[PDB]
Design brief:
alpha+beta, Immunoglobulin-like, TIM Barrel, nine-stranded parallel sheet, eight-stranded antiparallel sheet, 14 helices, 19% helix, 30% strand, globular, binds a molecule of 3 linked components (GLC-GLC-AC1), binds a molecule of 3 linked components (NAG-FUC-NAG), binds a molecule of 2 linked components (NAG-NAG), binds 2-acetamido-2-deoxy-beta-D-glucopyranose, hydrolase, carbohydrate, alpha-glucosidase, glycoside hydrolase family 31, (beta/alpha)8-barrel
């Protein structure tokens, strides 16, 4: 039998007397036994959510099906031959329903007529049909192969940021190490961005399937096809047309990136295997002796009593010593983050288990708590869809925090990971689904090393449907526990994620390896998590698995000092890799962490921008240069903010790197006299000695920096130095957001914050540098001072009333007081 026969339009109508939506009823042409029962009648709606977002929702006309609950991911409710067209005068997107047999639909741009999503079937080829079976949804669009450049569909390790043609991407959260290319990893993000090189260069849109079920997405260059094993089609198309606008639109739907406290941009140290409190104190002390900044010390599962959450090893990490350790960190302006796993050990004398049982908080299967295996041995898993389990989790965190202060939490193993695979329930098509997704690259059963699909959650929800939400739900509950126990802005790092997780948590790339490949893989993954609305992202510096080398670690701290989340972490069976252990690594770390710390106000401003509009901190070159098609395929360079580009060495033995430079003039942030100037964008062979990484700022940008220091608190008390990079063709601008670094509501109505905008423009004989300030009172009360301005990008010197560098020193200006400074040429 054929896979399916598709659907015909039975009726369709655009609702008059309203900002139009379109409603249609589809009927199945013919049943097929392949992949299980076809849904006979579908309700099909297309509607505009905003002018820039089109929503296409396809459900069973006669029965409710699983959808991600509104409480989990709040969003506007669904709307209340021949073609049927839907358009709005203030929308660029035009929707068309084609009454062919089988039927089709397209979305195109009113302005350019470019077709963005084309689900018109090829009548002879059922692989192109919409097929809608209880456990097999198939939706396919053709694509213009050479002109469509796609990014996203995480989480997967790949050597390229742009998706390669001819691959299958599987979304099924799994405890599979990120050192493995291609395989489905810890998170599922069914979003892609499509940048078109033609007809209008840089025209971008986004496509999101809001569905938490397992799926395979097959991309062959001229087509992309979703093959989803449950749920509904609830497809959102975001009009763009710039890549930035796409992410603003996408995060408006899934949630804005959470704000992060200023200290989370400091350097973090962790290792699986630290043996006792004396060892972690020694590591903190050695960082200080090496003069390498260290902001946060982390403890992995070693700190627990026999790997049990909410306990301390009474021999190796005794409470009195841990309390002294944390008090000392805090006296020195440092912070402490411990790990938590979701599985609760089943020991009848363990207080956490006793309380979990009393509140009936655990996931069940066959009516009994589901017994998994993780680090402490036998565990039950809290059901984070159950309000009682969330209350339990809040209470356990409160109890532990009351005994040992903490500054944030790292939540791991929350796919959920299970070290055993349970036998499938006989006869269940959930544990034995008719279509097998490409789990682990080998069509491995979905229950492998996780909680079985037939396990049940609050509201009679199956693990089959809710699996991909577990990590996301635990992050919501964990952030709530932190907010309920401290008035500071919280900090959370989570392994497993789903679309929307960025509203609650940071992420890291997971179990990478100390390999040169993985050093490079960290860049596409960092860029992808920006697109996923999770801009606080990084990889374990020097590599988690396998022993690192001096050279790899030196090149990795050079790159990793620029990740939004910068942490050295390592597995227990490997050589130690704290940055002070090799002199060449330590010397490089001091240099690059020095620059990162000077850039703290800039990272923090970019965090504020990400929370406001979804724009990532670490971004692809084509976010700033979308009209430059040469940037679309770059995977080994990235921007921090608009105009700073990092071009790392990624090969052993190299003392140069061939790096792409977009049109214009670029200046090294490590030596302002070193510059690159290109006309048409091109590759430049940058010198990159063992102790150096290339980081350049482009003309047209102004960045406010503060001084180096050993802690971010100390850094905030230093003077500001403004770096102004002039351009011959456009005025230069920049922005600085300031608050106390820890307010719950960032930029809220309380007004405990200031936003400064900087401007600079050259006349024929003068130069004006100025600022404009919103809420001057607050920055004034914080005493922030701008004592220097450096001006790059001109070929003549300026003073107060080849390229040269002009420095205006001794200013003593309050950052809170708007200024206008007039300079003259020499
Ligand atoms: C520590 C890590 O352990 C577990 O994962 C490891 C597997 O047990 C190993 O067998 C090995 O599996 C890889 C095979 O060697 C390779 O041939 C290929 O099949 O890929 C396999 C990996 O999928 O390596 C795995 C990763 O080291 C466990 O599943 C994983 O969750 C553990 N990592 C977390 C645990 C801790 C300790 O609390 C944290 O330090 C880490 O940051 C966590 O991510
Ligand atoms: C549940 O937790 C108990 C408290 O730690 C465990 O019993 C204790 O195990 C210690 C470490 O293995 C051992 O030194 C203690 O003498 C003993 N304490 C008590 C109060 O019995 C218990 O461990 C299991 O049961 C004991 C009797 C021994 O046979 C251990 O070897 C067992 O692992 C924990 N139960 C389970 C299922 O782990
Ligand atoms: C800096 O120079 C610019 C010109 O490059 C000045 O702008 C001109 O000012 C004169 C009066 O002094 C006007 O008649 C011209 O029409 C202006 N030109 C433009 C383009 O607007 C500017 O005033 C100077 N700034 C200062 C404070 O000296
Ligand atoms: C900075 O760059 C210039 C130009 O190559 C060079 O002469 C100088 O020695 C460099 N070193 C410093 C001072 O950082």
């Amino acid at each position: 039998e054929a896979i399916g026969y598709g659907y015909q339009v039975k009726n369709a109508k655009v609702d008059n007397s309203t900002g139009k939506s379109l409603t249609a009823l589809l009927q199945l042409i013919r049943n097929s036994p392949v992949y299980g029962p076809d849904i006979q009648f579908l309700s099909f709606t297309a509607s505009f959510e905003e002018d820039d977002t089109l929503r296409i929702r396809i459900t069973d006309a006669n029965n409710r099906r699983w959808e991600i609950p509104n409480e989990v991911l709040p969003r506007p409710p669904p709307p209340p031959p021949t073609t049927t067209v839907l358009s709005h005068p203030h929308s660029d997107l035009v929707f068309t329903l084609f009454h062919t047999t089988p039927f089709g639909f397209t979305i195109y741009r009113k302005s350019t007529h470019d077709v963005l999503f084309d689900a018109t079937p090829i009548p002879s080829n059922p692989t192109t049909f919409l097929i809608y079976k209880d456990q097999y949804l198939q939706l396919s669009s053709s694509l213009p192969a050479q002109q469509a450049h796609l990014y996203g569909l995480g989480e997967h390790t790949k050597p390229t940021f742009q998706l390669a043609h001819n691959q299958i991407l599987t979304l099924w959260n799994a405890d599979i190490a990120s050192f493995n290319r291609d395989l489905n990893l810890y998170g599922s993000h069914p979003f892609y961005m499509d940048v078109r090189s033609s007809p209008m260069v840089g025209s971008t849109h986004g496509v999101f399937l809001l569905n938490s079920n397992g799926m395979d997405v097959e991309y062959t260059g001229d087509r992309i096809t979703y093959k989803v094993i449950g749920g509904i089609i609830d497809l959102y198309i975001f009009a763009g047309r710039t890549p930035e606008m796409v992410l603003d639109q996408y995060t408006k739907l899934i949630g804005r990136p959470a704000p992060m406290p200023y200290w989370a941009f400091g350097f973090h140290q962790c290792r699986w295997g630290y043996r006792d409190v004396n060892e972690i104190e020694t590591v903190v002390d050695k960082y200080a002796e090496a003069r390498i900044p260290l902001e946060v010390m982390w403890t992995d599962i070693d700190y627990m009593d026999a790997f049990k959450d909410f306990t301390l090893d009474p021999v190796h990490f005794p409470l009195d010593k841990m309390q002294q350790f944390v008090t000392k960190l805090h006296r020195n302006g440092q912070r402490y983050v411990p790990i938590l796993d979701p599985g609760i050990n089943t020991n009848k004398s363990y207080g956490t288990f006793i309380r979990g049982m009393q509140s009936n908080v655990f996931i069940k299967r066959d009516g009994n708590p589901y017994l998994g295996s993780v680090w402490p041995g036998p565990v039950y898993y809290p059901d984070f869809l159950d309000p009682a389990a969330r209350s339990f989790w809040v209470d356990e965190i409160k109890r532990f925090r009351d005994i040992l202060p903490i500054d944030g939490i790292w939540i791991d193993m929350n796919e959920a990971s299970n070290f055993i695979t349970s036998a499938p329930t006989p006869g269940s098509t959930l544990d034995n689904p008719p279509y097998k997704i490409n789990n682990s690259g080998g069509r491995v059963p979905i229950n492998s090393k996780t909680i079985p699909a037939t396990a049940m959650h609050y509201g009679n929800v199956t693990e089959y449907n809710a699996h991909n939400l577990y990590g996301f739900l635990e992050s919501q509950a964990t952030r709530e526990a932190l907010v309920r126990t401290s008035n500071e802005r919280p900090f959370l790092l989570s392994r497993s994620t789903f679309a929307g997780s960025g509203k609650y948590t940071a992420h890291w790339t997971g179990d990478n390896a100390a390999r040169w490949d993985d050093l490079q893989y960290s860049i596409p993954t960092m860029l992808n998590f920006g697109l996923f609305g999770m801009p606080m992202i990084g990889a374990d510096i020097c590599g988690f698995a396998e022993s690192t080398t001096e050279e790899l670690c030196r090149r990795w701290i050079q790159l990793g000092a620029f990740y939004p989340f910068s942490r050295d972490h390592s597995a227990r069976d490997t050589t130690h890799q704290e940055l002070y252990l090799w002199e060449s690594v330590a010397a490089s770390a001091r240099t690059v962490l020095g620059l990162r710390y000077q850039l703290l106000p800039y990272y923090y401003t970019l965090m504020y921008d990400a929370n406001l509009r979804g724009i990532p901190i670490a971004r692809p070159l084509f976010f700033t240069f979308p009209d430059d098609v040469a940037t679309y395929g770059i995977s080994s360079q990235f921007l921090i903010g608009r105009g700073i580009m990092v071009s790392p060495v990624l090969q052993p033995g190299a003392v140069s790197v061939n790096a792409y430079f977009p049109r214009g003039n670029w200046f090294s942030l490590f030596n302002y006299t070193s510059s690159v100037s290109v006309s048409a964008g091109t590759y430049v062979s940058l010198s990159a000695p063992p102790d150096h990484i290339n980081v350049h700022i482009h003309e047209g940008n102004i960045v406010a920096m503060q001084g180096e220091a050993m802690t971010t608190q100390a850094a905030r008390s230093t003077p500001f130095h403004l770096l102004v990079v002039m351009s011959d063709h456009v005025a230069s601008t920049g922005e600085l957001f300031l608050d106390n670094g820890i307010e719950m509501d960032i930029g809220g109505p309380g007004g405990k914050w200031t936003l400064v905008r900087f401007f600079a423009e050259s006349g024929i004989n003068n130069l004006t540098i100025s600022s404009e300030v919103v809420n001057r009172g607050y920055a004034m009360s914080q005493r922030w001072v701008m004592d220097k301005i450096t001006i790059l990008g001109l070929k003549r010197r300026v003073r107060i009333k080849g390229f040269v560098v002009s420095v205006i020193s001794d200013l003593r200006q309050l950052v809170g007081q708007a200024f206008k400074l007039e300079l003259e040429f020499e």
